[PDB]
């Protein structure tokens, strides 16, 4: 359906320009292909309830990347030695096959031949694999969120740096793999990552400056239609009853225990959560810059006075909160920590809780039983949303 | 037509090295430049040719300096053909040279590129790279035309390697036989030029704040070997190949193979020709930089009150703070570093190193210059260990050798280091520094590496005083928490404090709330954040001398910076050593480089001074310069045994004084008001007794 | 060379222009020197080896310019290697 | 002498004190204003000569290389900037952006500059010849 | 160790004086043929304002002396 939805694209473009006057002389239009991204076809239930029966359908994932391979080439169009026959040869592949004929060139000079290829005038292309973590939107226990490794073709490349928080619509795939790798003999059981079609860039507002090519203008044609799209549901009645509900009095005390029906009269500690739900708006200044956008609440009292539980009750409330205990967690856990991968030699992040919960509110418990070789992240992250590490190999700031 | 494409631009090259490719003549160098360029060659051994880019546009319009760079790796062994044609007529050295290798270095390209920029499309094309190298690997002689050995006719093969894998010719190319039996390889008639590998980083400019640098790793071949050092920002150019890589396997997948044989497996890496490092030389930088802009510097220099007009315009968004505001406009503009007789060499940077109560705005600072002053670096200490601050110490699997990490200091050569949180790093980081602050060079003695690498580095600091917030009833001593010597070697201390007031914290909330209002950014600050970083990179260059007399009073000057400092009983100070003297020098050299002018006069030694020694009613800068110079003015017409001295002499005399106040007429009559205020204020202080 | 050193004031004139930009601490010269210069070693047989060479600890303090005088060593003398106790790694002192 | 921007007589001292005149400088004041209109605008075509002589070479800088024909201007900018004026002339992204409308205006026959929600998209390169217009200076 | 080189900063009205004009002229002292000639030379000025014996033969003194 892609295939003949190029097809039809290429066409009606040609109908258009035989009908407006001048645009790419009807064939520099005609010779370049057209691809389409098609996106938002119906959110999927993230990792978990990935079948095997849909192999070959059009999944819709969300959740931060973890590491980017670097921009690695992929073999389009063969450009073969010129041989002492002098008169190199150039051939594509369309297939995982690259066919290199026996004879040499147009004359048969050599008819007995060793062509050879030259590997830099050939063309490529851009395939970057894209690790990636989704939400912890509904991990129940016991196993950490789980993990999809992607691939981009060449138009999408690097518009996913690490620590973004991008969301994805591609089909599914399922490769075999190889034990010995000496014999062609595969092995069952498949491996799976996702042939991505088009990615919802961020799903953040930050807008300091671009990633990549192209694509921006993607992001500029997404950006405007934003009220149903991120509301993701809007209806009148939906909004009616809204502003029904925000012309009640008691409001404010009224959504309060809204929250967390289950507690007791303790209430403004309920209006000090909910005012956090809102928190804030992000002025983004030309000159400065990071505001802090959000809030911070701590909350102590006499022991069992409800304020774990309000904390649970919250974190369950939040589409994106992190639960965490204190003097069970490590800076590294608060934090998450940077890895040179000396595989590709690249900069991977991993399991950030404060970064899982960019956006969106956190929870820590026993904070005073908090070591104080720990609680002196926060005492960064707090106040400027940004993450200084500086070890060994690799100094950077990662902002959450 | 692609043999004739490459023909024709040999024909084109060969021509534009041929004539003259600079007019110049009778003031610069002579007309004819390349053929001068290979003359100079020809005496020496210099192996290779830079020629810049620019010309090459200059030559057909960009259409043969377009076509070199789109595609070039084409090209390169074409050019460098081409060029043989040439110099085999003017300097016979290629016969002479029993070796017909020639670099051809490009250099000056209109358009660097972040290393994020670099696709596949840009494959086998020409380009420039910024960025930051890092582990630089060591030299190995690298294989490019061998000689092979026929197994039976022993024949010799000029066989050319394309950095793949062996290659080897199919038939024997003595007609005697057209075996296939592998010949054997010389290392004797094979020309090798060693290439040495550095891994380069996406410098902090580029990348958006908050995401992690990519970066590469790129191969330096012919002699721009050995010209990286790890920490020295480079703008490398050269060709954007692809090598094979067997070992990428498994995740990716799909990847075909060479089967109509095994799969070839790829990946980018840049290959550079030519290296460039940089980064009274105004004989350089001014003529460098074309009349126009001397206009813009001309106005933002020959202002009168520059000094002012930039300091209260550094953090347009923090309110006030003139004391801290200064002491970072002084950060940006170092000393001069001059090393003293043969004997030894001495600092010439600032390390400012605030020390404030909480909400004082201190890392705010921060968090601007090390986004304005170039090649900076932030890292918030506590998180990051000693090891990685200074050096590192890593193995890498090309020699199977250990080597060197550059870290935050020898990536921050020649720009601010910041740093937040001193007293959080444990002293076992704190110690790393140290080398970086006085001897201003690190040395390391690891794993059987021993090196030095000098740190040309400003540092800053941040760290919050022992109790969050220090007791003024407690003393200064026991309140730091920091040893004497890292307490020393800051040439600067502000130990900030914050305390409660009205005609103040009414004026910071509505500052605040302004900014939060956007709509009301009424912020803008003189001079841009732009036209200062010019301003600066201008005023950097200036390295001014003590000539004047100033000399004679710094030193008495110092004298008294150390009698006021009344530690015990005639025990040693605290916070002032002869180091401070060294840094009073520097502060002072900087104030001059701030107001373009050399030979510091000693009232720049009066303001090095004072910021040094820090730690009704209007603006209360004003009424103080008020004071001071109506008290000089006074002393004169003692000395000058004058008869006497009026109110509204001295209001006149302001009219001579502050002419260019300017404004208005309605200002006049204001700040003559304002004088008379002044004047009857000091009235009723006790500063001047007044008469009849 | 002998010309000069034949004369009276070399073990002097010596220290003083052993620093080249240093003012006062004639004494820490006049060690710097001696331990500069070195003394004839002499192995024993008889009961251990004893060498003739100088080894001078500095107990410095903040301000006096000790390690400018141990970079103008570095500088001067044939044989320095300059190592900090930061980088120590006893491993790299010593062989290993 | 040759334009060393140094001023070490200025900083002297406190010197202005022979014209003892009279309110006589209300009279320069009075002026002073007047000049504050001309000024003003001065350093404005400061601008127009500045940002003038940075495009003498922008048409060499995106032509050079650049051969990408949908180019955004976010992308452009943040690529003239960071490029060769990180040397001894920098210059600040918005004035990029200036620099970018200027030679659109300067030469509308090529560069056809159209925007279309945020940022203005940028025309296909042609390669025309430049300086017979920069000459309009 | 044999000998411990005892240093100690101690505030003084008048050696610092003396001490502080050292360090003051020191930084300022350090800041074709015929040129290399009058550049050289000049340098050697320098090595003369400290009186004593120049660098140069000091390290060969050296070299002599520990050979
Ligand atoms: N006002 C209240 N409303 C609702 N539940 C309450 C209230 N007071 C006590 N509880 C219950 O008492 C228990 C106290 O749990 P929490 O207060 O959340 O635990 P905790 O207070 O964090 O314990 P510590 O010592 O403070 S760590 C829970 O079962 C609560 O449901
Ligand atoms: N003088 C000031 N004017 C305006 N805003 C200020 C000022 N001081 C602080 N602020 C604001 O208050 C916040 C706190 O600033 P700082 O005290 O610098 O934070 P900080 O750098 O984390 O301090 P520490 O010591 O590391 S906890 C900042 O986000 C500022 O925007
Ligand atoms: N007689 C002197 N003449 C000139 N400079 C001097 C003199 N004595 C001390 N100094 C200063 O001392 C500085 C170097 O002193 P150092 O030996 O490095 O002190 P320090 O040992 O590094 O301090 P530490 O090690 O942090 S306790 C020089 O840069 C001078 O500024």
Known sequence: VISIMDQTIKDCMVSLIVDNNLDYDLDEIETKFYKVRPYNVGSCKGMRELNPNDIDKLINLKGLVLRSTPVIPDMKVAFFKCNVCDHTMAVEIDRGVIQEPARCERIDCNEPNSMSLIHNRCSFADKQVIKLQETPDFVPDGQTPHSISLCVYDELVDSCRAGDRIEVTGTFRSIPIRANSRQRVLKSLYKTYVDVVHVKKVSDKRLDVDTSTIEQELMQNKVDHNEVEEVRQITDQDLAKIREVAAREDLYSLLARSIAPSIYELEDVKKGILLQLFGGTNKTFTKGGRYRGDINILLCGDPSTSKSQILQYVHKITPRGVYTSGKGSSAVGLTAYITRDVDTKQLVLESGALVLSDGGVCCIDEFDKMSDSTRSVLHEVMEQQTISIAKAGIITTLNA | VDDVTGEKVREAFEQFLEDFSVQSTDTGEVEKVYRAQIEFMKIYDLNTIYIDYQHLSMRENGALAMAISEQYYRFLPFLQKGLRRVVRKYAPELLNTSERVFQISFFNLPTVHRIRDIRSEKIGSLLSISGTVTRTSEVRPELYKASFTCDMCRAIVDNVEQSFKYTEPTFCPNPSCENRAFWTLNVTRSRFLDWQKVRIQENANEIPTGSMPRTLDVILRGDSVERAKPGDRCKFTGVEIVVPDVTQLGLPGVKPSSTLVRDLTYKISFLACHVISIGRDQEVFLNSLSSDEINELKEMVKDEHIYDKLVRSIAPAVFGHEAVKKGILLQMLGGVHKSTVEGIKLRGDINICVVGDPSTSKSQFLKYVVGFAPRSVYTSGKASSAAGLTAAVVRDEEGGDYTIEAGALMLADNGICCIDEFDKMDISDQVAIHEAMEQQTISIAKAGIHATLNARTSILAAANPVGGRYNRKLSLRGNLNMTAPIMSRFDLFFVILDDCNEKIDTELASHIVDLHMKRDEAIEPPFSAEQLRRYIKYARTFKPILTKEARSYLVEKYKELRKDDAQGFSRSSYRITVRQLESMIRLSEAIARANCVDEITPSFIAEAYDLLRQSTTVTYDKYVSMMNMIVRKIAEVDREGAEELTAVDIVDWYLLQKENDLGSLAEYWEERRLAFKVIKRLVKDRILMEIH | FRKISRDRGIIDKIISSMAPSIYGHRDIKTAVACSLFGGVPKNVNGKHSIRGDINVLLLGDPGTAKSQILKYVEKTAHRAVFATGQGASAVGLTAS | NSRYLANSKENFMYKEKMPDSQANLMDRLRERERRSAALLSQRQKRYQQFLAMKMTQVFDILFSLTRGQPYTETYLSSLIVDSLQDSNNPIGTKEASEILAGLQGILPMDISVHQVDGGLKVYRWNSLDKNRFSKLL | ?67
């Open chain 5, 1 to 67: 160790f044999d000998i411990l080189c005892v240093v100690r900063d101690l505030v003084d009205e008048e050696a610092d004086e003396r001490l502080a004009t050292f360090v003051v002229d020191s930084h300022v002292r350090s800041h074709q043929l015929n040129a290399r000639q009058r550049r050289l030379q000049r340098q050697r000025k320098k090595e003369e304002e400290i009186s004593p014996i120049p660098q140069e033969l000091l390290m060969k003194y050296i070299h002599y002396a520990r050979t």
